[PDB]
Design an enzyme around this catalytic site. Structure first.
Site, PDB file in Angstrom:
ATOM      1  N   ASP A  85       0.939  -1.425  -0.316  1.00 15.79           N
ATOM      2  CA  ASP A  85       0.003   0.383   0.357  1.00 15.79           C
ATOM      3  C   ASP A  85       1.083   1.416   0.172  1.00 15.79           C
ATOM      4  O   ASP A  85       0.998   1.897   0.431  1.00 15.79           O
ATOM      5  CB  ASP A  85      -1.077  -0.040   1.749  1.00 15.79           C
ATOM      6  CG  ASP A  85      -1.396   1.023   1.440  1.00 15.79           C
ATOM      7  OD1 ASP A  85      -2.359   1.765   0.499  1.00 15.79           O
ATOM      8  OD2 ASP A  85      -2.290   1.773   2.347  1.00 15.79           O
TER       9      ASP A  85
ATOM     10  N   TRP B  65       5.814  -3.766   7.805  1.00 12.75           N
ATOM     11  CA  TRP B  65       4.574  -4.684   7.774  1.00 12.75           C
ATOM     12  C   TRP B  65       5.135  -6.334   6.641  1.00 12.75           C
ATOM     13  O   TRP B  65       6.236  -5.797   6.306  1.00 12.75           O
ATOM     14  CB  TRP B  65       3.031  -4.879   7.579  1.00 12.75           C
ATOM     15  CG  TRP B  65       3.159  -3.965   5.853  1.00 12.75           C
ATOM     16  CD1 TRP B  65       2.846  -4.578   4.754  1.00 12.75           C
ATOM     17  CD2 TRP B  65       3.363  -2.536   5.281  1.00 12.75           C
ATOM     18  NE1 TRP B  65       2.842  -3.627   3.648  1.00 12.75           N
ATOM     19  CE2 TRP B  65       2.979  -1.923   3.634  1.00 12.75           C
ATOM     20  CE3 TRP B  65       2.956  -1.401   6.304  1.00 12.75           C
ATOM     21  CZ2 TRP B  65       2.975  -0.719   3.602  1.00 12.75           C
ATOM     22  CZ3 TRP B  65       3.190  -0.089   5.477  1.00 12.75           C
ATOM     23  CH2 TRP B  65       3.686  -0.522   3.997  1.00 12.75           C
TER      24      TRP B  65
ATOM     25  N   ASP C  87       9.473   0.882   4.355  1.00 18.05           N
ATOM     26  CA  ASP C  87       9.366   1.881   3.919  1.00 18.05           C
ATOM     27  C   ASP C  87      11.117   2.641   3.836  1.00 18.05           C
ATOM     28  O   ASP C  87      12.025   2.396   4.282  1.00 18.05           O
ATOM     29  CB  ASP C  87       8.193   2.857   4.253  1.00 18.05           C
ATOM     30  CG  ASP C  87       6.977   2.711   4.033  1.00 18.05           C
ATOM     31  OD1 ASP C  87       6.256   1.640   3.293  1.00 18.05           O
ATOM     32  OD2 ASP C  87       6.135   2.997   5.141  1.00 18.05           O
TER      33      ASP C  87
ATOM     34  N   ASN D 137      -1.221  -2.613   6.227  1.00 13.23           N
ATOM     35  CA  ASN D 137      -0.626  -2.151   5.380  1.00 13.23           C
ATOM     36  C   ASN D 137      -1.311  -1.180   5.627  1.00 13.23           C
ATOM     37  O   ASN D 137      -1.450  -0.134   4.600  1.00 13.23           O
ATOM     38  CB  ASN D 137      -0.463  -2.571   4.185  1.00 13.23           C
ATOM     39  CG  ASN D 137      -1.699  -2.807   2.886  1.00 13.23           C
ATOM     40  OD1 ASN D 137      -2.462  -2.649   3.372  1.00 13.23           O
ATOM     41  ND2 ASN D 137      -1.583  -3.173   2.129  1.00 13.23           N
ATOM     42  N   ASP D 138      -2.346  -0.180   6.554  1.00 14.49           N
ATOM     43  CA  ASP D 138      -3.368   0.993   6.428  1.00 14.49           C
ATOM     44  C   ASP D 138      -2.631   1.808   7.107  1.00 14.49           C
ATOM     45  O   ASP D 138      -3.236   2.559   7.467  1.00 14.49           O
ATOM     46  CB  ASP D 138      -4.898   0.961   6.571  1.00 14.49           C
ATOM     47  CG  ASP D 138      -5.425   0.021   5.563  1.00 14.49           C
ATOM     48  OD1 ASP D 138      -5.137  -0.403   4.012  1.00 14.49           O
ATOM     49  OD2 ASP D 138      -6.528  -0.321   6.041  1.00 14.49           O
ATOM     50  N   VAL D 139      -1.138   1.585   7.743  1.00 12.36           N
ATOM     51  CA  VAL D 139      -0.859   2.583   8.984  1.00 12.36           C
ATOM     52  C   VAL D 139       0.390   2.482   8.311  1.00 12.36           C
ATOM     53  O   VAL D 139       0.829   1.719   7.158  1.00 12.36           O
ATOM     54  CB  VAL D 139      -0.684   1.754  10.563  1.00 12.36           C
ATOM     55  CG1 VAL D 139      -1.675   1.654  10.361  1.00 12.36           C
ATOM     56  CG2 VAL D 139       0.198   0.592   9.572  1.00 12.36           C
TER      57      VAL D 139
HETATM   58  C1  HY1 Z   1       2.637   3.239   4.253  1.00  9.98           C
HETATM   59  O1  HY1 Z   1       3.188   2.933   5.501  1.00  9.98           O
HETATM   60  C2  HY1 Z   1       2.132   4.387   3.568  1.00  9.98           C
HETATM   61  C3  HY1 Z   1       1.122   4.712   4.247  1.00  9.98           C
HETATM   62  C4  HY1 Z   1       1.780   6.250   5.002  1.00  9.98           C
HETATM   63  C5  HY1 Z   1       0.824   6.755   5.190  1.00  9.98           C
HETATM   64  C6  HY1 Z   1      -0.835   6.005   6.003  1.00  9.98           C
HETATM   65  C7  HY1 Z   1      -1.247   4.796   4.653  1.00  9.98           C
HETATM   66  C8  HY1 Z   1      -0.463   4.022   4.564  1.00  9.98           C
END
Ligand code: HY1
Ligand code: HY1
Lengths: 360, 122, 110, 361
Positions: free
Chosen positions: B26, B51, B70, B98-100
């Site tokens: 994501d 993740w 990341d 993966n929404d963080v």
């Molecule tokens: C993965 O770290 C990309 C991301 C950043 C911010 C919010 C959701 C996903």
């Protein structure tokens, strides 16, 4: 003529909705767009810096944002904050300092909530260790860090108690936290296991009633948590699906993907066919309308590729949101009726919310 | 084994969301952002946390653990955005989610791009 | 018609029309601050056939409105005629210089 | 198996690099510089530049200079205007130089953020809205002081034949020349005779810059020149870009960074469009015209690809053009330019592209 400032939003509060635009392509300039749902008019906005989250105070008077700043944006000291804004003037009023671990992530409702009495803001932390943070609105202070919630995720307020909420934990059960009037944990309890984390994971988004909550699963099952008493009682699964539905592999998908109409017990769910591993965030092919008493579907309508929704109880409305456009539905009867679509309400939004009208 | 070695593969294949090891990305692929599958673009900082996904390699028929670190401390790359969700789970299974922002613990948490580091056989 | 870039008063707007942003042609959207300074345009009124001075005060201190972007240039001139020039942020002297939207304030006959 | 690493340099060599300054006007607080390889269109990296960044590369090719504005809480709190020094190869931040809170906020004309020929001073436009020119001492990492003599003038045109001299265009229609001392303060100055009528034939600020002279085009397609070979600046013009046929179809210049000079040949490049009238001076190019500045005749015309801005590389005989989002690469080693490629999606809202300097001593 003379240009003036100091003006209030031009439409009444009862007309207002809040579209949280992550602006993921330029995530340091996220913002809340304020719209009139009755006519699609843009009313104003609140800037929310990097990956803002938003909610409106239960009494309707203020907007709360949560965001992260750094001294030089991409370098320098981090400040995580809650901000309090006037809802009518859309002006900044105060900053509340948080520890540098507020959740950065997509805009699920349960990451940034408040107690039913509106006296405490209740927010998710991740450092990446998880805990729940408590902000005293009156004092303007971060007052409690609920480490008991480690290994859990998101905040589901109990609408039948003044300062109680639940969170979903890695054991497949729910942890309930009851705050005292000082915002510190006064008591807590843990439910029995509700769902199998490995075999039937649920979506975190609740379909929330006054005294119970329903959750849907990756495979189209429904679990319920009854909090009429101090101890939460859990049950399920029942299936959203009949045999024909199963043949075409219908499953839920989306983000803020469910809703409950409290007066009828109707639950709304985004669904798509050809479900398989990896499709749990697919846009809706359909919205299904479920009777939670009889545990049977009553209606189904086109989904308009929606990903998130929200419900207004008192005007019997549902909004849905596909990332950019907001659809307004009348849900006073079992079949929703599409009233209008607001095009280009956001560039990258997964969350829309009504201005509260029900008070505290 | 070119299927395990993205730097030897076709850039157009590796820069696709359909590339086998990107199965729970994501974000923006770092390989389209001036980095590679396993290196941050210049001036962006690796995340110490991530993740994790389990992805199937169709070339050799085996399943591999992938760590989605990341690169951080620069603003959004904006190129090769993917939102793939194989075996991804919600935040109560936090390191599968993966929404963080997995830059959340970096000195600067601004999200730049995301990649897919091969850890080993699942 | 006021939300169109072709509206006669918007003849030297380089920015977002505040009337599309929760404000009006002469008022800032809630929570955005007027600029005390501006570029000025001279625009032709299609009704009475006369030219009018229009003062393009900005509204400032919120991020870009993003709606009704216009880039019209009637009688616009470069920075060596500074107050006729619209490729600069007329929020530059505000307490917060972030540009939100542009208003089109009728001053009077040119 | 694998391990994610940082600390890496840009993958392509300096001579392949260009800098596309993306204002991101729709989200102007997240402006940035995109670094591209012009030989193959590869994205190489980027430099974040906060609210309305400006950019230039150090003359010696080692550093990227940016100019930007921060506030403590973006839309509120204390303002900091700065120049930042970044390493060109690692694309990492090295130094912040504090400016007074009046650096120009505006679209990315080259002449708002420049340097002296000797590279020792950064020279920038201020506007409070009162105008002055700001001087930054690169060696010291310091702001020197306002050049107040430039009040009522606009933009910086360095003189490539002197180490620390530059000109600016003033509201009287003439040029003010500023000569700096070794400390960055004004050592001397001079004012030319009127070059152009501000009322009757206003010029675009973008110079077509030679080593010892500069040319400027006007709203109505005329050309003015300033010769700074001598002790003081000698001005002349107009001569017309247009023939009778041109005039009959109302061809005029239009764009932002809309001209360029190929110094070795004396060829001037300019974006032009037909049906000129009041209000069309920033219209996209219908064509690019190539003018011989010695014979004062047009020697080529080619499609404009809706370009608004350009830049020239003297060292490789190239011209880049830019339509706001896409960059076109032209070989200009002969009078008629040849289109080599287009880089699509280089920016969302850019009006300025620049080569990484090669040589130039
Ligand atoms: C993965 O770290 C990309 C991301 C950043 C911010 C919010 C959701 C996903
Ligand atoms: C008008 O003030 C809009 C604007 C802002 C910033 C740069 C250029 C133009």
């Amino acid at each position: 003529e003379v240009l003036t400032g100091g003006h209030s939003v031009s439409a009444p509060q009862e007309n207002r909705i809040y579209v949280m635009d992550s602006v993921f392509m330029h995530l340091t300039e996220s913002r809340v767009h304020v719209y009139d749902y009755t006519n699609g008019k843009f009313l104003g906005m609140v800037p929310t810096a990097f990956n803002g989250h938003v909610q409106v105070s239960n009494d309707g008077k203020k907007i709360y944002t949560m965001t992260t700043y750094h001294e030089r944006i991409t370098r320098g000291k981090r400040s995580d904050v809650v901000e309090v804004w006037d809802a009518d003037k859309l002006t900044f009023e105060k900053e509340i300092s948080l520890p540098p671990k507020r959740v950065q992530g997509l805009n699920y409702d349960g990451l940034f909530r408040q107690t039913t009495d509106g006296k405490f803001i209740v927010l998710q932390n991740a450092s990446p260790a998880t805990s729940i943070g408590i902000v005293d609105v009156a004092k303007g202070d971060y007052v409690e860090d609920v480490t008991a919630a480690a290994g859990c995720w998101s905040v589901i307020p109990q609408p039948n108690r003044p300062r109680s909420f639940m969170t979903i934990c890695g054991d497949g059960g729910l942890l309930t936290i009851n705050l005292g009037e000082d915002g510190k944990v006064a008591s807590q309890s843990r439910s029995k296991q509700m769902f199998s984390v490995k075999d039937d994971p649920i979506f975190i988004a609740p379909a929330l009633d006054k005294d119970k909550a329903h959750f849907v699963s990756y495979y189209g099952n429904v679990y319920s948590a009854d909090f009429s008493g101090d101890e939460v009682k859990v049950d399920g699964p029942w299936s959203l699906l009949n045999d024909e539905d199963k043949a075409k592999n219908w499953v839920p998908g989306g983000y803020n993907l469910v809703g409950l109409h409290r007066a009828s017990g109707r639950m709304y769910v985004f669904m798509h066919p050809d479900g398989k591993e990896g499709t749990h965030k697919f846009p809706a092919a359909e919205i299904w309308v479920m009777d939670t008493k009889t545990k049977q579907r009553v209606a189904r309508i086109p989904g308009r590729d929606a990903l998130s929704m929200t419900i207004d109880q008192q005007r019997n409305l549902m909004l849905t949101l596909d990332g950019g456009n907001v659809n307004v539905y009348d849900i006073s009867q079992p079949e929703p009726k599409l009233l209008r679509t607001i095009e280009g309400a956001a560039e990258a939004s997964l969350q829309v919310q009504f201005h509260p009208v029900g008070g505290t | 084994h070119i299927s395990l070695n993205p730097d030897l593969a076709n850039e157009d294949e590796v820069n696709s969301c359909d590339y086998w090891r990107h199965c729970a990305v994501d974000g923006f692929l770092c390989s389209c952002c001036g980095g590679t599958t396993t290196t941050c673009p210049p001036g962006s900082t690796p995340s110490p946390i991530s993740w994790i996904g389990t992805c199937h390699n169709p070339h050799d028929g085996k399943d591999y653990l992938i760590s989605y670190h990341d690169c951080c401390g620069k603003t959004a790359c904006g190129r090769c955005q993917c939102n793939t969700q194989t075996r991804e789970r919600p935040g109560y299974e936090f390191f599968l989610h993966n929404d963080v922002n997995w830059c959340m613990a970096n000195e600067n948490s601004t999200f730049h791009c995301t990649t897919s580091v091969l850890v080993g056989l699942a």
